[PDB]
Design a protein around this ligand. Structure first.
Ligand SMILES: OC[C@@H](O)[C@@H](O)[C@H](O)[C@@H](O)CO
Ligand SMILES: OC[C@@H](O)[C@@H](O)[C@H](O)[C@@H](O)CO
Ligand SMILES: OC[C@@H](O)[C@@H](O)[C@H](O)[C@@H](O)CO
Ligand SMILES: OC[C@@H](O)[C@@H](O)[C@H](O)[C@@H](O)CO
Lengths: 239, 239, 239, 239
């Protein structure tokens, strides 16, 4: 079980963040779902009763990112887990892409992730026990030619995770990430035609509910042990 | 459960291979323990009844490595899993080390691992379903200055695993590895004084029984999904 | 020689960008020095005569980053080389650092670098011949525990460079980077006390004039060949 | 110039080792060419006069690898440079390849390289000044799916080089490697049909004489600076 522990999930309104939030709830926890889409959250706040706490944060406003931390402790307190799942996608060639989404992407996939971790760590250091999981990707361990802006952001995540945990583990904290291949998501529309055609694998891609069990296996682990990364991909995906 | 599946484990006579073999047996499987030490195996063949099949193979004789495959099918058949856990250690500076152990190490940590995989794959391609797990290390993802010969071998393993699975997954096969930090083992005597002192962490290092559960989680996984690597280390180990 | 070719250098007002700009000038080229400090540039515009073109760009305003490209072609045209040397530093623990510099850093070390490349590439694709060099770091190939925010940005650069060149080389373009260890720079004040003490190596660290010769060796290279990266560090630096 | 320095080159009888040996000779040095093919060496010993010293070493006999070091000091002494260029190739799928060449390859591409370095280092530590260059490959920085056995060996080389230099640089020694893409070589016959077709690039591949100049640039470098690696590939090669 997850006893009476509290967890926060960015981008929880949909996709992996959604699957991760629902799986934590099952194990017995209050979960604070964070995303920009309140209308999407609303439907979750009721058919999930009481234990689902919504928190609307653009997360792309420096003022909003800082709202995050205290608001969690305000709304529920008892923070023991953070899951920075918030992420986007930009694929194809570098030209033919706008300067805009780029900025927005790296800031959400890198800047936001770091700031969130930076802002929630003081709590865990006083309290001791802390747990942090970042949503990485298979692109963190491969130079995928068709997503230069996306893979690079995940390479930054790879470094950041293993390096930051080296300066925090003395305070009873665990840090890790999940590096999944392609997964069913609205983000699949943001792909280029390079591959995708690959993602037509009758090896039904990866289901977002499957990675959540890995997240649980990472959380539900002897405190003495830390799982820093997990490389998972659809068996019938060529990479 | 592991139904009536059969598995083979190199270096199963002790350490991680030993923990891995025992955990498979629990899930319900015949396991072929492979190692050079028959006297060590003997004690396992009886107090583990019937389901423990011994196979004495030096594994450092080209003639013996080839004995491996048919002998498994001879002794029990029904091979669905291979675990290349056989490995050794060489630490310290490069000078002050003998040319000999080196050769012996790389051959066992690289040459033997590959040959074993090469020799058991034909079976799985005809049969379809196959599963392969290689025992890697945290050194596969770090340039540890105090074990030049050991880390490099694990970097080769990192490449080999993810690259070989790209040319086999079309035949219903899963390939992956486990990259654990330091673990209680007779190999701990082979360490230099560089760190080790680190391994005095009252964060009781890593227990070999804990990684075995990760191996099960890798095996006991939807066939559609493949876990390629798992980074685990003692929480109180600085790396 | 660099014939009548033109080059642009970000952060050219000081440090590696300064050394790189001066070395190009020697080989025979007009160089557009780009930086926020006009007063620093001014002194360079006169004691370097005619061939030094200044361009004041904050580079941390989306409106200013887009000013870059046309202004180069406006001020001098004939662009054949881009050098994205602009970068900053953030070291120490993650806590004890402000959310602000972080954002500013990743945006300059990642977002700005990409946008600059994105905006200058169309020219080279029409013209054919193009050359791009990014200033990376030794941290691009190591998880330095004491600079989590800086190393991660360089890991992104490592991916970005080798991956972007795979989708441009068909148009007669070369892309690469330089990954130097610590070098004498005003950025040395931004270091933590972790190491630095190392940088007291009577092995006089690395001189910024030495890396510039590597840049020339990268540029001054058979067009048929592309140098993608160069790992250089002070001989007496432990990493 | 290379003053009156002496250098040793493994696999110098042909290919990159051949180009490297000839380029050193030009700069002014005695060079000991090492290879299994005496008949190939013979033709070099005469039309290259006096400064070319042959040394026939199988290099795949543990007894022969140890012959190496003293014999160099026997034949010429004054060793200041070692170049471990000796290497082979194995491509295609893992099945369809023999256990034999594999063993032979990893031993020559990994075991032999290490042993050679291990055996020549004591000299340089007493003498102080030393220089070591290992012939790596682009495969050291990519998981090439069509050469599992070759790339993995180069990943080991990548670790070995940067990690070994960390425990030797205090004795006035420089260590590095060259990571070139595909190059014209008799080893081109050992390729699979996967790509090769790529190597039909009218971007004339890479010429072995071009990498030698990089080697010189690595050697001919301020002692205070060490070039640890150089990533070079044919501009019109997709990787
Ligand atoms: O939804 C994005 C996906 O989860 C990510 O993993 C990459 O797109 C994939 O790895 C391709 O490299
Ligand atoms: O028993 C060996 C250990 O399991 C291995 O993981 C390394 O020694 C460790 O990672 C140090 O880098
Ligand atoms: O000025 C910054 C320096 O050039 C950079 O290279 C890193 O600080 C160094 O590598 C430490 O890892
Ligand atoms: O002759 C071998 C070649 O030099 C090597 O570099 C690889 O074959 C190439 O990189 C393919 O990955």
């Amino acid at each position: 079980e997850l006893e009476g522990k509290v967890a926060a999930v960015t981008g929880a309104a949909s996709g992996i963040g959604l699957a991760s939030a629902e799986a934590m709830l099952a194990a017995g926890a209050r979960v604070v779902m964070v995303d920009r889409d309140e209308a999407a959250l609303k439907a979750l706040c009721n058919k999930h009763g009481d234990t689902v706490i919504p928190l609307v944060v653009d997360l792309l406003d420096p003022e909003d990112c800082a709202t995050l931390l205290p608001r969690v402790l305000e709304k529920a307190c008892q923070l023991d887990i953070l899951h920075a799942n918030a992420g986007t996608y930009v694929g194809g060639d570098l030209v033919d892409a706008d300067t805009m989404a780029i900025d927005r992407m790296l800031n959400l996939n890198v800047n936001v992730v770091m700031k969130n971790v930076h802002d929630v760590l003081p709590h865990m250091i006083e309290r001791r026990t802390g747990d942090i999981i970042v949503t990485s990707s298979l692109a963190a361990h491969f130079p995928t030619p068709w997503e230069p802006v996306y893979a690079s952001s995940k390479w930054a995540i790879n470094c950041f995770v293993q390096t930051v945990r080296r300066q925090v583990f003395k305070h009873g904290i665990r840090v890790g990430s999940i590096s999944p291949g392609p997964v069913v998501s609205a983000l699949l529309a943001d792909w280029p035609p390079e591959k995708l055609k690959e993602a037509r694998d009758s090896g039904s891609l990866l289901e977002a509910s499957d990675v959540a069990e890995v997240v649980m296996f990472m959380l539900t682990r002897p405190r003495g042990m830390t799982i820093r990364d997990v490389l998972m991909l659809p068996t019938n995906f060529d990479l």
